[PDB]
Amino acid sequence: MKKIILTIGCPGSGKSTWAREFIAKNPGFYNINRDDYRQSIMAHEERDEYKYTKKKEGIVTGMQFDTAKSILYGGDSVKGVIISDTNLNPERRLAWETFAKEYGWKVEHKVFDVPWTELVKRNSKRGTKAVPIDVLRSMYKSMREYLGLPVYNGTPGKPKAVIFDVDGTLAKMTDVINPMVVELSKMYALMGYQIVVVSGRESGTKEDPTKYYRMTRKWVEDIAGVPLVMQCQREQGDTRKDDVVKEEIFWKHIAPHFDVKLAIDDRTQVVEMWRRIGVECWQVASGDF
Amino acid sequence: MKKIILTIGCPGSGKSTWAREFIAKNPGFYNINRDDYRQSIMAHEERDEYKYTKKKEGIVTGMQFDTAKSILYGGDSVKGVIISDTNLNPERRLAWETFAKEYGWKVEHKVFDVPWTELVKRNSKRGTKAVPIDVLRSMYKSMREYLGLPVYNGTPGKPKAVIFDVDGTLAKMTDVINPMVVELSKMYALMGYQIVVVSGRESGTKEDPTKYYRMTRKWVEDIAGVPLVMQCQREQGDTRKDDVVKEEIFWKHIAPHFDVKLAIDDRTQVVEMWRRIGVECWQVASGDF
Amino acid sequence: MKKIILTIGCPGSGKSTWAREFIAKNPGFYNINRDDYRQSIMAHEERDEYKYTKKKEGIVTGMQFDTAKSILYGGDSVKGVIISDTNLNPERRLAWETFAKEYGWKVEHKVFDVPWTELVKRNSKRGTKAVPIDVLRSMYKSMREYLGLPVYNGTPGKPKAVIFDVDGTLAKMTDVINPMVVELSKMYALMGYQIVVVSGRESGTKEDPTKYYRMTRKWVEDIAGVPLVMQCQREQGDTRKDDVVKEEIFWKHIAPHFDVKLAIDDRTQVVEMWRRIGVECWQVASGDF
Amino acid sequence: MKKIILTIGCPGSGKSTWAREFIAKNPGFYNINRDDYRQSIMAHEERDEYKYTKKKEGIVTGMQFDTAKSILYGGDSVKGVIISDTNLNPERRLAWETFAKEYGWKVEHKVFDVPWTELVKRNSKRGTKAVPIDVLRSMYKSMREYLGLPVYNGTPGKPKAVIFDVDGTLAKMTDVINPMVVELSKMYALMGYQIVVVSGRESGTKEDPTKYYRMTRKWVEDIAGVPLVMQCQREQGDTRKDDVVKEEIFWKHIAPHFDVKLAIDDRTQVVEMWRRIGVECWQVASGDF
Ligand SMILES: [Ca+2]
Ligand SMILES: [Ca+2]
Ligand SMILES: [Ca+2]
Ligand SMILES: [Ca+2]
Predict the structure, then answer these.
(1) CA–CA separation, B235 vs B25, rounded Å?
(2) Record's Gene3D superfamilies (chains A, B, C, D)?
(3) Are strands C160-165 and C80-83 parallel, antiparallel or unpaired?
């Protein structure tokens, strides 16, 4: 049975580099792509900015299926076709499976799951064919939904709480307290909120695995006076992205003991994470690092 | 007297497009540029990512002055040279004036002041030679300092206050209140803070110039219950960027009656503005629109 | 009646620059193109070299008509479509007219006739999407056939003859004779051939309109000893390409009095011309100027 | 002693791809290049066509040595510099050795000898930064002079002769004779010239190593009636370029028994070869294959 391969990825994920790579080695497959159709029918030049239209889209979609059927109804040399689109919308993925249903073709998937941070890096350098930051975020959001990744919906029972970062949030860089924010934690203290403190600093070093955890705990507790309830920090020896560390700490140490209602941070890649998993977050300062 | 033209702009401002344009029409001038030297001495290809080095920089700087003196000490056909760099660091601008001092050349300036928002648009589409978002912000920050633009340092006397946006901040889009944030305004109400409300919505329409100001004032005051003290909104008929509107409203209506200690918003271009002028700001949600 | 515009041109003629230009101003038309389809179905990157296949072509053609019918059978907003291909093969042009026949659409033409020399200039600088020199020549050859331009088939009656250029052919640059070639003219003298001499040098200058014609005639006749029968040269004040001058001189002064059986030259652009119009030609030296 | 590496190659030879490759692995070296300086001082954009000037050149040269001395008189970390230019002019190569002489640096060479045919292939696809065909030929001509490759100056003693190709020269493609050319051989027969015939066709096949040599010899001798004196053809099993085959046959079988005064061919790559080695050649037809 001839196959129809759908690539599943956000722009910059690797879909195309793969499609060409593949097709080159597997003579028999052929590439079909929206971006290409979108540019060709406008005779656009690489540096042009395509304008969105419901009309042009229909056209483009039509061009896809028609070419699909048209290349899949050829010589017994045709192994199948690749749809190197983002394919992140489900109603669209379904559309393909149904279409391949009433013609006798199977549908396969080739995923290109790349970390948010890496997608952003490439996007910015995509240039013209780059994609706005707000659409990349949504894309990735749909990719998380396709992968099944979790979204925190709360925690019935346990007390509500606000999370605070240390570097750049409560502290400004033996640094000095960031007034307005430290006050915040103390105001959420009045209200009746539990205050969990968090930090991406390594707990300590090889020989003193808590050197920094201790130095931080001291600071927070004796210079900032943050009435915390629980403090968490990156374990010594962890070289994974801040992105990933704080999520893991949230799920394994926070989520199951608190009803998180807010998170305060400054680092963009972290703030971006809190919001994906379903946790409101306020960035207290420009943090593009 | 031969001249040495320094272009003053952030990347994407227009420096180079101008330099080539100019030189083409004014036979006699010659271009000198860091970026070019930085790429040539590494034999880099357009798509390569140059790595920063204090050593390589020295080299590059040396290449500049040497070529400067070398092209300015030529035939009486040489009108002068253009330094198409960002030239935003002052210690560097001075260096040129002193150098041109001890050789008999005058220093001229050609400014390319482009709105932040426009710089960001182009940067993202610059591709490889694009520049990280954090360095663009600093660049622009230096450009504001060179232009003399104001930076709010506070207001001795008048009462302290926090500013709140409406669309997407206090309200989520007859929309519904955004819980955590509306609570914030009320908590800053306890403390003893004056709460100024702000909005980029047009006050009203041609015939009803306050239709929206009224609809907003009602909402804020009777559904959100925000104990504001002053409400400001974009005057009907204003088609300038949100960026620009709220700054103007700040300087002409807020700054002179309040000691602003914080601003709450969600729209990135606005949050970016509050911080340039020296006003802490917390983004309560992803707002890349 | 909806229209289907076929652009007629060799690559580099201007087809695409026009299509985009047009479509931008005439909202309603849409671009369809082989090159685009050829690259998309291979997921090729700009710098890749497509490999020709009878199979892939069929595919591409199918993609054209299908999209043609598919975009021409849409909303009453669709004015028509543009086929920005070379469309130089007639069997192909016919195919379109017949197709548009059995659907109710008219076929229009938009020609982009550019001089050979200019096509070659652009081609070389086309880079990757450039086209081999032998295919450009054929293309252009088909364009001449579409324009109706003449092809010399001979001249029944008048005596046979060989044409010789002067600069770089009979003479090497008061220059000195090019031995082997001057001998040639004299050998074609034995055989029984009439020898017509030709030159792209201006006959003379403003005030002495024959200064060079005379200087040449002297040389040819008294240092080279070429037993010519007729000498022709570029009239003083003619700034048109050598290409064009010698063709005009051929048709208006040579073709009607001689049965040309060969032409000797060295300048590529001229040799290229002699052969298009149906005249054998031998290049006696590298002449890429 | 610090080194100054001169790359020796025609454009497209590989100089730059190598320089970047090298420098990346050998931290300590730095690239200096004319092309870069030539573009930077005009603020040209990739797609611009630089205009040659004796003035701008001086500038560029000055920029080289100055940067050379300037980067070679730095920290003990500087291993040396690479001059990724064509460096094909000798007066220029000398200039470097003398310069590095009066400063204490040694001069090294890194050659990039690529076949003519391959240089032409890449050039055409170089695009903007491509180089005219006439300058490539000269470049390569200088490269042959630097490599020491031979240039035939004649053969005192042995009889003079003209060489003729078969495919496309004497024959037009059991093909049919090309009238005007076959007549030529017979006319050079009168004069008193020896006629050597040559062919790039394989002599024969695996089992019949002369099948084609015989078929050709028959044709030439009994249908064209060419009064040859010696026939040479590509030995069965030789898959090297026509370019290379005929040169080898010339040096090992022709040059030492004849005083070649002309060669007739049609294939461009072959005609290009005859002329490099110092043998006049006439292309009888467009042969870009
Ligand atoms: Ca932080
Ligand atoms: Ca808002
Ligand atoms: Ca000539
Ligand atoms: Ca041949």
Answers:
(1) 45
(2) HAD superfamily/HAD-like, P-loop containing nucleotide triphosphate hydrolases
(3) unpaired
Question: What is the SS3 assignment for B132-150?
Answer: CHHHHHHHHHHHHHHHCCC
Q: Which chain C positions have a beta carbon within 8 Å of A45's beta carbon?
A: 20
CA distances from C53 to B81, C40, C46, C57, C60 (A): 54, 15, 19, 6, 10
Domain tally, chain D: 2
Report the candidate in A1, A73, A87 with the shortest Cα–Cα distance to residue A30: A73
Give the strand pairing for B281-283 and B171-172. unpaired
Q: Which helix (H) or strand (E) holds C57?
A: helix C54-72
Q: How far is CA D187 from the centre of its chain?
A: 32
Which of C149, C168, C202 corresponds to the end of one domain?
A: C149
C262 vs A219: CA distance, rounded Å = 97
Contact of A15 with A9, CB cutoff 8 Å: yes
Phi and psi at residue D223, in whole multiples of 5°?
Answer: -130, -30
What DSSP state is assigned to residue B220?
I
Q: H/E element holding D276?
A: helix D268-276
Q: Mark whether A and D touch (3+ CB pairs within 8 Å).
A: no
Assess contact for B141 and B40: CB atoms under 8 A: no
Q: How many CB atoms lie within 10 A of CB A47?
A: 9
> Are residues B113 and B186 both part of a single domain?
no
Distance CA C67, CA C57 (A): 15
A161 is written with which tokens? 């709480």
- Do A34 and A81 fall into the same domain? yes
Packed helices D268-276 and D133-147: angle between N→C axes, nearest 10 degrees? 50
The CA C270 to ligand 3 mean position distance, Å, reads 8
CB C270 within 8 A of CB C200: yes
A151 CB-contact burial (10 Å; exposed 0-12 / middle 13-18 / buried 19+): exposed
Interchain CB distance below 8 Å, A127 and B126: yes
The DSSP result for A214-237, as a single string, is HHHHHHIIIII----SEEEEEPTT
Tokens of D256: 């030492």
- C126 given a catalytic annotation: yes
Measured N-to-C along each axis, helices B133-147 and B116-124 cross at an angle, to the nearest 10 degrees, of: 150
State the method. Answer: X-ray
Is D29 in a helix, a strand, or coil?
strand
Shared-domain flag, residues D206 and D281? yes
Residues C146/C169, Cβ–Cβ less than 8 Å? no
Using the Cα atoms of residue C224, residue C229, residue C235 and residue C236 in order, give the sign of their dihedral.
positive
Whether B136 and B7 share a structural domain = yes
Query: Domain of A114?
Result: 2-149
- D129 in Cβ contact with D35 (< 8 Å): yes
Torsion of CA A83, A84, A88, A90, to 10 degrees: 0
Contacting residues of D for B85, CB less than 8 Å apart? none
Same domain? For A85 and A48 the reply is: yes
Cβ burial of C156 (10 Å; 0-12, 13-18, 19+) is: exposed
Residue A223 falls inside a structural domain:
yes
Residue D24 and residue D137 share a domain: yes
Report the distance separating Cα D154 and Cα A280, nearest Å: 89
Give yes or no: residues D174 and D125 share one domain: no
Any CB–CB contact under 8 A between A44 and chain C?
yes
Buried b (16+ CB within 10 A) or exposed e, D125-142: bbbebbbebeebbebbbb
Instruction: For residue B98, give the amino acid letter.
Output: T
- Closest Cβ–Cβ partner in B134, B280, B285 for A180: B280
Burial B171-197 (b: 16+ CB within 10 A, else e): beeeeebbeebbbbbebbbeeebbbbb
Question: B267: number of CA atoms within 13 Å, CB side?
Answer: 23
Sign of the Cα torsion A260, A262, A266, A269 reads: positive
Q: Which two tokens stand for residue B266?
A: 């969600």
